[PDB]
């Protein structure tokens, strides 16, 4: 019934499905044990699309938890929620990918990797019916840049029909964590834009951005953004878990976010998100949201949508509300603002509805955009590449593990491509 | 997840003894040698409430491996491991290298060889000495030759020590500098400097210790050795093995040669009335009169700078603290490194060494920093050792060793060469 | 429903401001913590035109509230009812105006208005038809001078049609608290004549007169003034608040009290205003209230009345009243009074009464009045300026911040001609 | 709103003695450096329950550096703050600006830098010297040029200490204070003047002590310098920033030297047979007999007047009092600046120093005025220079550290364009 098998890889990766599963488990009251104790029994109807029965009314996620660092491991082991996960699915190497793209993909995950696509036959053949694969993973460093592409053209490869769903967390040069950021980004998303149908492009800009403005806190910690990007992946598979006015599955989002092939960079929203001292100061109203929604400062990337176009957005609802003001809201957002929508598709909105809210919030939203302003995250890092790679500096690491600087031209080129096509419908 | 330490000369066992006081420190392991996963990096368990280094100490004169062997550390190490030689390599690169270095690498680099098998996660090596010598210099470079054909593959991380640009014990080093380094840049994949009077400078300003021994110096250079391992003795924010300095120092395969750095260098009466963050030590570090080299920053240019923080840091305000360091002008890096700049943070802090020098702090930064900044030191080392080349002083002793006038000169156009280097990436 | 967003600038047009909302507060029965305690019905009918409805019944002012001081919003937020405000709408710089017109206007305050105006926008959107846009600034400084007169032009641009209505508080020579008196007052004049359609002429000297003669207190406080201003506030939006057998919009009031687009310089009044000693020996009714209204020495403004003519005024009423009494009234004070009144206009009066007094008090009165007196204000701000612009004193400082001389040569033709028109119609 | 001071010379830091002793004593801040929002201006919080002043105290010769190193204020500095020279400047201008000032600037001024980076609001600066001997008037110039070329936009405070007419502590001081003013007429944003025997006159008179030292004079001097700051440390009706002083005392950007004073000066006894309002204090810092240089203010004109108050005052008497001060002939204001007059007040009242000599008030004014009263200090201190310069005294002593003719003609001349602008603005 449109299961989703996800994965898990590189450090953020794990970081961000960690705390993850930590908030739709409290969506739908399961215990860090594992067993049932929800109130409502609609949380129970869908529990199937990410977690497997077992016996004495327990469940296990279908979690594929893949690293090369067995120290992440054991962070996630011994977290609040580690019992829970089977303890079969934790694949993982001895020495870590030491920020190398061509380690993950040719050396290190390419032993690993063949063991982990058998647990993804396990789940899969398990499945009545899989809808996509949830992926998350960060183009900074070696291992979910490198040995993700990898495992997503093997899923790819054997399933050619399945939505491939990907969560790729890339830095911007305002916080440059590692001096590899380049070479792990340019070659992962050249792998990517053949292969997968979303690509949710998270910056950790953004995400410290958020933390001030809007969220007013002093000291944010990862585990604070992780909570933040978890609540756009409960919103987006909110429609396929719950029952709803408007059901869109990730095919159904699919569709309308990716006027052409390539086209599938999203950059995602979430909303309400207020401070502790602006909760009361605040109406629980539908036109608040949208406002909120549509902030250009509001978004998850670098990019701030001003400097282009939508080409297609979508707004994922949560709880009770009436339709009509979510229609007058998605009307309203296009009139005054044609300047950031194209005109040459006439409706560039898509609306969806849960009659379940969040777990202590009275209503919420999710935001998905597939903006032309999008191109300067991939401009960015294709200056950093071509500032880096005009001395050759670093390269010699790559050549090692086989990789031939031809790759790194084909990258190149099917990145400006990139850049050039989302100019085009600006 | 382990790496195994080799100990040459004077200057290197001098440096395990206070550099291993204070990693069985770090983990609670007294002088006894006992009492989870954090000290088996560079502890192994022997059998019920016991550990042991995985540690090597070579000194071809016995006049301080049996000073260990009598000292306060006599149960923690294996008395195995304490190997000693019979007679002194006596300040010559060719006597412990070819006629004293030959007779005793049969036996200690086999035993190296017992370690790792007896280890499983050899990151890679760790090796000490200095360029003073005969035996930090002749013996380690016979030595690595061995080794390198041995492995290869695996890591070695050198933290020698220079002669400084005017102090200096002896006379004849500038030989033993030159002829070392020649047959260290084609083996060693980090080369880490140290300096003795710029860490004679650093303990009098900010340490306000103005008659230090041997054994001060050496606490804190072992803090900076144990700094970049603790990423893989504990946990943290974003950790960083020993592969990381390999790839993200190293842009070209013969430049491998960082600097290391240390903050807040500060006295116990000076915490009280200092605030210690991210942002100070980080500026700390970068300026000249805190560099454990006596070769200024601005001169040159940083082609890569590798920030590892301890202690509680939050992982949001180095950001703030680097982008102070991009826009101040009198520190920049290189066009085709624009993003020179890697974060590592630990949540456990440092541990003071009881009896020592240095205070208590609840955060700490071991920045290590390639540049072209060490060309000045190599110039000016280059250039004494010509004085004395061109008049043959001290040739004599070398020559009678075995060696020639052709190994000076490969020694010579190596330096060249490697200077060639610097230039050539200082555009 | 003809809502109104509120503007607070500079330090006294923060402290006015903030008790400014203390009185109506009171008016509506609304708690600090903002919840709704009222008696009467009618006071939760407009209570949309100054609040907006939230959770738990709770309410919070449309009030932006903007300094470059951050001291001025801590003893905001401290006082008796800074938790009732939004904490979003506290947008403030770090460092003050130092008494500057060209640091608010052009580097401090350009900056931070940016940011303020899509406050502006965010309260705007949420409104159903707003009307007008009630600002308070002082004249004396840099941060109500500079920065308001520049937000004015901003709101004024984007809002064309509105009803910009300001109080400038405007000193005299006999209480001169700041030796940049005439440089703020004057060039902030150029920017409201030629955009603005109320200004509010109000002066600290006349403040204090009203303290000692018919108030007889000992010991005037700056909130003891604060109170009186407020009063006059409250008294021009009483139709738009309340039912009344006669209900004029500020539009209704600025289209009798403009009779030429420039004419729109103000002199509030209000009434009873009697000391504790004189409560009881006095009469409530109707023209009690009309001499004190009326009365030369009653106004808050340092020109006499006497030494002009009214062009028109208004007098709005307030509480349970005979409409006849009030026209006779109206009457009487054109009849015997007639060389205080252009005879080329009939009839110089406005009339409205509304059902609802002030809290504690039975009956009030609101005068507003457009007086060709009011020119000599001018006239001695232009003496000042004349004074020190004869030798350029303190206008270096102005230059550092790129204002040019002949801005100061056209402030002091524009304000020059504001003299002779009213000196025309006298 | 942060401002970071220095101080120069021993008249410098025997202000800080002092001054500091009243700013730790109005926070709260014990000697040992501990006991919300008041005490950020001048005093860092370190790690938990301890402060630390944001001070530099630097004076080439080691006396009294070392005093407070061993005085009752050891805990309350951090130790590397309080810089000291090695010799003495020794009432030479050009001593203690090229020989022994070129070599503790690259110190001090760098030092300066980290005080700034670890703040965040510094508004401006504020230095305490005198232009008697060579180290509070030649540091203070060489510092003042790279201090302006270094930052330049900010504001610097500088409260200058007088030789007086005929009381005079030295001999050679007329070259000090003319060769210091000609650079620091172009640096200087503000220039706060103090007299000695005028300081003496008033203690004398209205305080009642006839025999004064040193330490009773900088306890008013440090309570003129916390007034002016005190609108930034506290809440008031209408406070007062330090930018208020540069737009609302200097009409032309050379004439920027106002004239401070203070009142009520009353003592213990004298309290209790006193009334203290806002008039008779008021007038009282116009007389000449309070005003803290000797010149009296009938012979000129008030060009501007701040009048910064304290304690309980409300904010209508006020308009009363400089309306009496407005209609009173014997003291009369520029035409071209008729409004002279800006008002400052603040809730929190002055402190009484414990021990000291000055009296616990409810309230009190600290009046700073701009006038052309001080050409006639600049005309006797400029004539009474030119009978030295003319038989070339003491001119052997200068041009032995490197100095000139030249110089001296264009400290003149300069000196004369000085006061060619007060004659000027006299009009
Ligand atoms: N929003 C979050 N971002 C994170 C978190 N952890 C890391 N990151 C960011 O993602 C960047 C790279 O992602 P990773 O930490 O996973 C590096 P990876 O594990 O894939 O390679 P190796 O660790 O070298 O084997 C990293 O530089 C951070 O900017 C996190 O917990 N939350
Ligand atoms: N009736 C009142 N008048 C006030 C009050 N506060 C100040 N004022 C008067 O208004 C004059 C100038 O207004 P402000 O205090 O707001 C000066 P502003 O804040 O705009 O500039 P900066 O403080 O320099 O940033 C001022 O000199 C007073 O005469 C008050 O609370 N009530
Ligand atoms: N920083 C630091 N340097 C040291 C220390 N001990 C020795 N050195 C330096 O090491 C240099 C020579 O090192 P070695 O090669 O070990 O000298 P050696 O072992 O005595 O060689 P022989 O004379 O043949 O016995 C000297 O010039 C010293 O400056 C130490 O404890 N700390
Ligand atoms: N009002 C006041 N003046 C002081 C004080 N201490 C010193 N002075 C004056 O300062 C003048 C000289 O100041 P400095 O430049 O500091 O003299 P110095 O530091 O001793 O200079 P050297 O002789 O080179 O050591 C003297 O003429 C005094 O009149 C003080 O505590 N209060």
């Given at each position: 019934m449109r299961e989703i098998v996800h994965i898990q890889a590189g450090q953020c990766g794990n970081q961000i499905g960690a705390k993850f599963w930590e908030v739709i488990s409290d969506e739908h009251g399961i215990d860090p044990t594992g067993s049932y104790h929800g109130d409502s029994?609609?949380?129970?109807?869908?529990?199937?699309?990410?977690?497997?029965?077992?016996?004495?009314?327990?469940?296990?996620?279908?979690?594929?938890?893949?690293?090369?660092?067995?120290?992440?491991?054991?962070?996630?082991?011994?977290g609040p929620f580690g019992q829970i996960f089977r303890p079969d699915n934790f694949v993982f190497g001895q020495s870590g990918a030491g920020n190398n793209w061509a380690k993950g993909h040719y050396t290190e995950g390419a032993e690993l990797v063949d063991s982990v696509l058998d647990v993804v036959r396990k789940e899969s053949e398990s499945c009545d019916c899989l809808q996509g694969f949830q992926l998350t993973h960060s183009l900074g460093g070696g291992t979910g840049?490198?040995?993700?592409?990898?495992?997503?053209?093997?899923?790819?490869?054997?399933?050619?029909?399945?939505?491939?769903?990907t969560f790729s967390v890339m830095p911007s040069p305002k916080v440059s964590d590692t001096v590899v950021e380049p070479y792990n980004a340019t070659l992962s998303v050249h792998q990517?834009?053949?292969?997968?149908?979303?690509?949710?492009?998270?910056?950790?800009?953004?995400?410290?951005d958020i933390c001030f403005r809007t969220?007013?806190?002093?000291?944010?910690?990862?585990?604070?953004?992780?909570?933040?990007?978890?609540?756009?992946?409960?919103?987006?598979?909110?429609?396929?878990?719950?029952?709803?006015?408007?059901?869109?599955?990730?095919?159904?989002?699919?569709v309308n976010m990716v006027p052409f092939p390539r086209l599938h960079f999203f950059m995602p929203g979430f909303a309400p998100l207020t401070s502790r001292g602006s909760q009361q100061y605040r109406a629980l109203t539908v036109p608040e949201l949208t406002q909120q929604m549509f902030d250009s400062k509001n978004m998850m990337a670098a990019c701030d949508p001003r400097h282009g176009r939508y080409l297609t957005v979508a707004a994922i609802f949560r709880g009770r509300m009436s339709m009509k003001e979510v229609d007058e809201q998605m009307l309203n957002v296009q009139n005054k603002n044609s300047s950031y929508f194209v005109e040459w598709i006439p409706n560039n909105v898509k609306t969806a509805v849960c009659d379940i809210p969040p777990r202590g919030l009275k209503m919420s939203a999710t935001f998905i955009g597939n903006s032309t302003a999008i191109q300067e995250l991939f401009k960015r890092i294709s200056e950093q590449f071509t500032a880096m790679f005009r001395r050759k500096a670093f390269l010699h690491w790559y050549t090692g593990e086989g990789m031939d600087e031809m790759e790194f031209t084909e990258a190149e080129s099917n990145m400006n491509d990139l850049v050039s096509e989302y100019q085009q419908y600006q | 997840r382990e790496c195994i330490s080799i100990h040459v000369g004077q200057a290197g066992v001098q440096i395990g003894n206070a550099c291993?006081?204070?990693?069985?420190?770090?983990?609670?392991?007294?002088?006894?040698?006992?009492?989870?996963?954090?000290?088996?990096?560079?502890?192994?368990?022997?059998?019920?409430?016991?550990?042991?280094?995985?540690?090597?100490?070579?000194?071809?004169?016995?006049?301080?491996?049996?000073?260990?062997?009598?000292?306060?550390?006599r149960q923690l190490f294996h008395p195995e491991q304490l190997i000693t030689g019979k007679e002194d390599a006596a300040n010559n690169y060719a006597r412990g290298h070819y006629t004293i270095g030959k007779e005793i690498i049969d036996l200690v680099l086999d035993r190296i060889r017992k370690l790792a098998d007896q280890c499983t996660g050899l990151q890679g090596f760790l090796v000490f000495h200095s360029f003073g010598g005969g035996t930090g210099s002749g013996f380690t470079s016979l030595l690595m030759e061995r080794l390198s054909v041995d492995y290869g593959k695996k890591s070695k991380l050198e933290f020698s020590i220079?002669?400084?640009?005017?102090?200096?014990?002896?006379?004849?080093?500038?030989?033993?500098?030159?002829?070392?380094?020649?047959?260290?840049?084609?083996?060693?994949?980090?080369?880490?400097?140290?300096?003795?009077?710029?860490?004679?400078?650093?303990?009098?300003?900010?340490?306000?210790?103005?008659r230090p021994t041997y054994t001060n110096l050496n606490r804190l250079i072992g803090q900076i050795v144990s700094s970049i391992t603790a990423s893989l003795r504990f946990d943290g924010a974003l950790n960083v093995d020993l592969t990381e300095f390999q790839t993200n120092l190293v842009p070209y395969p013969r430049i491998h040669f960082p600097?290391?750095?240390?903050?807040?260098?500060?006295?116990?009466?000076?915490?009280?009335?200092?605030?210690?963050?991210?942002?100070?030590?980080?500026?700390?570090?970068?300026?000249?009169?805190?560099?454990?080299?006596?070769?200024?920053?601005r001169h040159?240019?940083?082609?890569?700078?590798?920030?590892?923080?301890?202690?509680?840091?939050?992982?949001?305000?180095?950001?703030?603290?680097?982008?102070?360091?991009?826009?101040?002008?009198?520190?920049?890096?290189?066009?085709?490194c624009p993003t020179g700049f890697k974060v590592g943070i630990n949540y456990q802090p440092p541990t003071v060494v009881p009896g020592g020098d240095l205070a208590k702090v609840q955060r700490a930064v071991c920045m290590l920093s390639n540049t072209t900044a060490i060309a000045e030191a190599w110039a000016r080392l280059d250039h004494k050792f010509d004085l004395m080349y061109a008049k043959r002083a001290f040739v004599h002793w070398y020559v009678g060793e075995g060696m020639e006038e052709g190994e000076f000169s490969e020694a010579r156009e190596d330096m060249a060469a490697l200077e060639k280097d610097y230039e050539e990436v200082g555009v």
């Amino acid at each position: 019934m449109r299961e989703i098998v996800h994965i898990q890889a590189g450090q953020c990766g794990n970081q961000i499905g960690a705390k993850f599963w930590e908030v739709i488990s409290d969506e739908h009251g399961i215990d860090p044990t594992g067993s049932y104790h929800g109130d409502s029994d609609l949380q129970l109807e869908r529990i199937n699309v990410y977690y497997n029965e077992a016996a004495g009314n327990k469940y296990v996620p279908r979690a594929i938890l893949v690293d090369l660092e067995p120290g992440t491991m054991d962070s996630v082991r011994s977290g609040p929620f580690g019992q829970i996960f089977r303890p079969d699915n934790f694949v993982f190497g001895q020495s870590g990918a030491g920020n190398n793209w061509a380690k993950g993909h040719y050396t290190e995950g390419a032993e690993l990797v063949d063991s982990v696509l058998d647990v993804v036959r396990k789940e899969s053949e398990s499945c009545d019916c899989l809808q996509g694969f949830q992926l998350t993973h960060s183009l900074g460093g070696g291992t979910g840049s490198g040995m993700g592409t990898l495992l997503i053209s093997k899923i790819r490869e054997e399933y050619p029909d399945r939505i491939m769903n990907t969560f790729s967390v890339m830095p911007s040069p305002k916080v440059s964590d590692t001096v590899v950021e380049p070479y792990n980004a340019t070659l992962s998303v050249h792998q990517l834009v053949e292969n997968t149908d979303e690509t949710y492009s998270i910056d950790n800009e953004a995400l410290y951005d958020i933390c001030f403005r809007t969220l007013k806190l002093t000291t944010p910690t990862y585990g604070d953004l992780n909570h933040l990007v978890s609540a756009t992946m409960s919103g987006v598979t909110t429609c396929l878990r719950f029952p709803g006015q408007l059901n869109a599955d990730l095919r159904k989002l699919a569709v309308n976010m990716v006027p052409f092939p390539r086209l599938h960079f999203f950059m995602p929203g979430f909303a309400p998100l207020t401070s502790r001292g602006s909760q009361q100061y605040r109406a629980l109203t539908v036109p608040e949201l949208t406002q909120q929604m549509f902030d250009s400062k509001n978004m998850m990337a670098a990019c701030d949508p001003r400097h282009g176009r939508y080409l297609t957005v979508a707004a994922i609802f949560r709880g009770r509300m009436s339709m009509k003001e979510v229609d007058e809201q998605m009307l309203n957002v296009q009139n005054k603002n044609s300047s950031y929508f194209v005109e040459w598709i006439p409706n560039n909105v898509k609306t969806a509805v849960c009659d379940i809210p969040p777990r202590g919030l009275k209503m919420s939203a999710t935001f998905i955009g597939n903006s032309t302003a999008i191109q300067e995250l991939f401009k960015r890092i294709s200056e950093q590449f071509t500032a880096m790679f005009r001395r050759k500096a670093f390269l010699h690491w790559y050549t090692g593990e086989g990789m031939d600087e031809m790759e790194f031209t084909e990258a190149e080129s099917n990145m400006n491509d990139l850049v050039s096509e989302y100019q085009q419908y600006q | 997840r382990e790496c195994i330490s080799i100990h040459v000369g004077q200057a290197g066992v001098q440096i395990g003894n206070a550099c291993w006081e204070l990693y069985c420190l770090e983990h609670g392991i007294q002088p006894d040698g006992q009492m989870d996963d954090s000290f088996n990096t560079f502890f192994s368990e022997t059998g019920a409430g016991k550990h042991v280094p995985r540690a090597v100490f070579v000194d071809l004169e016995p006049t301080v491996i049996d000073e260990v062997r009598t000292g306060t550390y006599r149960q923690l190490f294996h008395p195995e491991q304490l190997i000693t030689g019979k007679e002194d390599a006596a300040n010559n690169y060719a006597r412990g290298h070819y006629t004293i270095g030959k007779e005793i690498i049969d036996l200690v680099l086999d035993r190296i060889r017992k370690l790792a098998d007896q280890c499983t996660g050899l990151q890679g090596f760790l090796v000490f000495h200095s360029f003073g010598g005969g035996t930090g210099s002749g013996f380690t470079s016979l030595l690595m030759e061995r080794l390198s054909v041995d492995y290869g593959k695996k890591s070695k991380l050198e933290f020698s020590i220079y002669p400084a640009p005017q102090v200096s014990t002896a006379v004849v080093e500038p030989y033993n500098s030159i002829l070392t380094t020649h047959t260290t840049l084609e083996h060693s994949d980090c080369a880490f400097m140290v300096d003795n009077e710029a860490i004679y400078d650093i303990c009098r300003r900010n340490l306000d210790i103005e008659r230090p021994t041997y054994t001060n110096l050496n606490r804190l250079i072992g803090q900076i050795v144990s700094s970049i391992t603790a990423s893989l003795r504990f946990d943290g924010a974003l950790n960083v093995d020993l592969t990381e300095f390999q790839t993200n120092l190293v842009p070209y395969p013969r430049i491998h040669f960082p600097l290391a750095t240390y903050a807040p260098v500060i006295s116990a009466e000076k915490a009280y009335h200092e605030q210690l963050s991210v942002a100070e030590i980080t500026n700390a570090c970068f300026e000249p009169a805190n560099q454990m080299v006596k070769c200024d920053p601005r001169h040159g240019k940083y082609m890569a700078c590798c920030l590892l923080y301890r202690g509680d840091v939050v992982p949001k305000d180095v950001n703030a603290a680097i982008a102070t360091i991009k826009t101040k002008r009198t520190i920049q890096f290189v066009d085709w490194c624009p993003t020179g700049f890697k974060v590592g943070i630990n949540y456990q802090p440092p541990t003071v060494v009881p009896g020592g020098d240095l205070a208590k702090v609840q955060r700490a930064v071991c920045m290590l920093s390639n540049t072209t900044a060490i060309a000045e030191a190599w110039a000016r080392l280059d250039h004494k050792f010509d004085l004395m080349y061109a008049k043959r002083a001290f040739v004599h002793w070398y020559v009678g060793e075995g060696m020639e006038e052709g190994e000076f000169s490969e020694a010579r156009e190596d330096m060249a060469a490697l200077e060639k280097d610097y230039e050539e990436v200082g555009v």
